[PDB]
Design an enzyme around this catalytic site. Structure first.
Site, PDB file in Angstrom:
ATOM      1  N   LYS A 211       0.925  -1.665  -8.856  1.00 51.53           N
ATOM      2  CA  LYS A 211      -0.305  -2.433  -9.025  1.00 51.53           C
ATOM      3  C   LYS A 211      -0.376  -3.074 -10.406  1.00 51.53           C
ATOM      4  O   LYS A 211      -0.708  -4.262 -10.537  1.00 51.53           O
ATOM      5  CB  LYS A 211      -1.512  -1.528  -8.787  1.00 51.53           C
ATOM      6  CG  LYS A 211      -1.545  -0.908  -7.405  1.00 51.53           C
ATOM      7  CD  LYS A 211      -2.627   0.146  -7.296  1.00 51.53           C
ATOM      8  CE  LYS A 211      -2.596   0.814  -5.936  1.00 51.53           C
ATOM      9  NZ  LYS A 211      -3.668   1.830  -5.795  1.00 51.53           N
TER      10      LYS A 211
ATOM     11  N   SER B 206     -10.694   6.464   0.800  1.00 53.25           N
ATOM     12  CA  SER B 206     -10.817   6.571  -0.648  1.00 53.25           C
ATOM     13  C   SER B 206     -11.689   5.438  -1.161  1.00 53.25           C
ATOM     14  O   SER B 206     -11.424   4.267  -0.870  1.00 53.25           O
ATOM     15  CB  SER B 206      -9.445   6.532  -1.328  1.00 53.25           C
ATOM     16  OG  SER B 206      -8.684   7.684  -1.010  1.00 53.25           O
TER      17      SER B 206
END
Lengths: 98, 426, 182, 49, 49
Positions: free
Chosen positions: C88, C45
């Site tokens: 995150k 990714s």
């Protein structure tokens, strides 16, 4: 080309749904004329045959149903007879005699 | 003599012994069974821990053996030249049956012989579902076990009768019981986690129709993008070398490169490199068949042609430009219809699919009703140029046509290449 | 990994090659590194952070360090959803609070992840107080606009600056080409 | 775009926390209507599931 | 044991309900017989609305 509905409609038109169906049972291997003819040849000639096809076909059920309709000559009575306390031979008698 | 036990050869004397080649190979009996058949005689098996065994006369064989199994179960046996000698007759079962009223009547009689209580509409619906399982309009599935199971479920959901409503309910329940992955996918699409463009135009992007296999079936759309840059004649397919793949020549990549290099001949080499990517993995790429979606996306990227995002594109393509048939066409079309209906049917959505698959189009009732109402369109194409014409909404040939636009994009890329070439000289 | 083609690298290269077309090839080579390993990289990714950092390096664009950048990206510049978005965002918030919240820190995250944003009480309280910001973006150009504090097109826009940097790199490469010739 | 607090707030608004709740037990497979219906079919028809 | 009983096989009038993870059933559903015996799939959603 843009397909119209009639060019895409595949379902069989339903006409009546208020009564049950009265249909005679189909012959064994219906729609399977190749397999039926091959098994008929193998039965007429007494050859060994093998049934091949994708799973979930009901091959065993149809095969048993087809063989149940066969009329073979009355097989003789095969049995084991002791010709001694150590030697055992195979005896063939007329059917119903063993 | 009284301890000899009769097996299956003894019980089938003057009759038929039905065996399974899968069992003949699983217990390794095939060698001894072949020996017995070839010799015409067989003695009962004796365990070695017996230094007193009888000298039993071998039992004559007057039976007929009928092996039953799958073709792959017999591939192990047909290799032996002796198997082709004992078993001369091959009773092969077709995976399908002709779709005729005679066959529907035979299926109804077979179901009645199984104890089911059918209705004419219920029999019709079961026959249609059998045709759909074969994925062919004119062929119904031969697998009677699966149709019997579906009839069992329909009888349970209808009490004891197979009416049309009961069979439709059984089919819907079968769909629902395996719909968890697709329900999650549709929920992600509606929320926005997976964003597919179902409206408007986009350059270099197309809605391919993939069949997901890292997950269960029910193929779904996937946003496939193509990016065109000045450079070599190299066609990069990012998803086919997610690891290595420079060691591997991919048949799809070779097909697309051949089409692009051969169809567009005004410079000695394709002055554009096209990078093809499948965003939102869960996409199981072919690697051996070039997709029509990939080719139309590449052409759009080269020519800056805004393709319609309303229409999904499925079907393989040939290096000539010929659109070939693909499997699970119904699954792909219905998955795109599900996605479009979840986001709202604009009335212009559709699926571009090969004319080869027209004999495999057994779409569900909802898709057919949308097509009848004009809310969903199905386009059948022979060549990739037709698909590009439908997507870009313009004719290939003629002034301001797609062909001229693609050639103009190619010559612009060539001009960028020569502008970098003079950068390498002065 | 030098013998393996990476989907992230291929995606970034495709984006950079296709979007910036005024020379026959990308006249700049971009080295992307993760300082301070302990970072588990995903080679399948392409990150939005990698793309915006590459654009900053090419165009000499000073990106804001207030805002952390998370999210994947495809070769067309479309920012895709990523997993553990809450983890995150909360980790960046923890780091910002440890060093002191200046009222301008934030996280640039995909709009695709807005259905997965279940931030804890402290992050939401900071967001309501204006001490932490959340930026949701559709495309990498939006993320670059937020980071560099300037629009892509306009008076001295980001696109013009990146193109000028590309022209400078191409001029340096032409100087090297004539060094090879003359 | 810069998300506001209301565009980011997700927690169910707490209206009271004093009195204990009195709730009837949920039916088996609550929120799992697919599995519940599949097991209903497998029990009505006697199939193995 | 050399000497034993010739026990008549016990008939089965039960319904089998296998339980496991999706990866647990990957190793079993390759068999065409598993899809023939266990035809009803009561799949559990990992989440609820």
């Amino acid at each position: 080309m843009r397909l119209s509905y009639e060019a895409l409609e595949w379902r069989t038109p339903i006409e009546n749904s208020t009564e049950p169906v009265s249909l005679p049972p189909p012959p064994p291997f219906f729609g399977q004329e190749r397999a039926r003819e091959a098994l008929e040849l193998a039965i007429r000639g007494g050859f060994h045959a093998y049934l091949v096809g994708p799973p979930s076909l009901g091959k065993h059920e149809a095969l048993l149903a087809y063989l149940s309709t066969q009329s073979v000559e009355t097989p003789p009575d095969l049995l084991y007879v002791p010709l001694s306390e150590r030697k055992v031979a195979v005896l063939t008698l007329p059917s119903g005699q063993e | 003599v009284s301890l000899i036990r009769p097996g299956a050869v003894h019980r089938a004397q003057g009759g038929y012994l039905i065996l399974d080649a899968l069992s003949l190979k699983r217990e390794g009996t095939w060698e001894a069974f072949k020996r017995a058949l070839r010799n015409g005689q067989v003695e009962p098996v004796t365990e070695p821990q017996a230094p007193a065994g009888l000298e039993v006369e071998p039992f004559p064989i007057q039976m007929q053996v009928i092996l039953v199994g799958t073709p792959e179960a017999f591939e192990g046996l047909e290799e032996d030249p002796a198997f082709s000698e004992l078993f001369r007759i091959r009773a092969e079962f077709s995976p399908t049956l002709p779709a005729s009223p005679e066959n529907c009547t035979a299926l109804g009689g077979w179901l009645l012989a199984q104890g089911f209580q059918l209705t004419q509409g219920g029999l019709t619906r079961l026959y249609d579902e059998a045709r759909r399982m074969a994925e062919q309009r004119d062929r119904m599935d031969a697998r009677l076990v699966e149709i019997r199971a579906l009839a069992e479920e329909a009888a349970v959901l209808g009490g004891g009768l197979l009416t049309a409503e009961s069979v439709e309910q059984a089919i819907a329940a079968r769909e629902h019981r395996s719909f968890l992955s697709e329900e999650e996918f549709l929920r992600a699409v509606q929320e926005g986690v997976i964003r597919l463009r179902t409206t408007g135009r986009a350059v270099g992007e197309v809605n391919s129709l993939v069949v997901v296999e890292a997950a269960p079936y029910w193929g779904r759309p996937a946003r496939l993008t193509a990016r065109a840059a000045p450079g070599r004649d190299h066609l990069i397919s990012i998803d086919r070398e997610a690891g290595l793949g420079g060691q591997i020549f991919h048949k799809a990549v070779l097909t697309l490169a051949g089409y692009l290099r051969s169809r567009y001949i005004e410079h000695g080499s394709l002055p554009v490199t096209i990078s093809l990517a499948f965003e939102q993995n869960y996409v199981s790429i072919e690697g051996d068949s070039a997709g029509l979606a990939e080719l139309v996306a590449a052409l759009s990227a080269i020519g800056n042609l805004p393709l319609r995002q309303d229409l999904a594109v499925t079907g393989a393509v040939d290096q000539t430009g010929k659109v070939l048939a693909v499997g699970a066409i119904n699954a792909k079309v219905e998955g795109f219809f599900r996605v479009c209906k979840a986001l709202g049917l604009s009335g212009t959505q559709g699926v571009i699919l090969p004319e080869a698959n027209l004999a495999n189009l057994t779409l569900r009732a909802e898709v057919l009703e949308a097509v009848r109402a004009g809310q969903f369109h199905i386009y059948a194409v022979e060549t990739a140029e037709q698909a590009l014409e439908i997507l870009a909404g313009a004719r290939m040939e003629g002034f301001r046509g797609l062909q001229e636009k693609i050639r103009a994009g190619l010559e612009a890329f060539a001009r960028l290449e020569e502008g970098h070439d003079k950068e390498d000289r002065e």
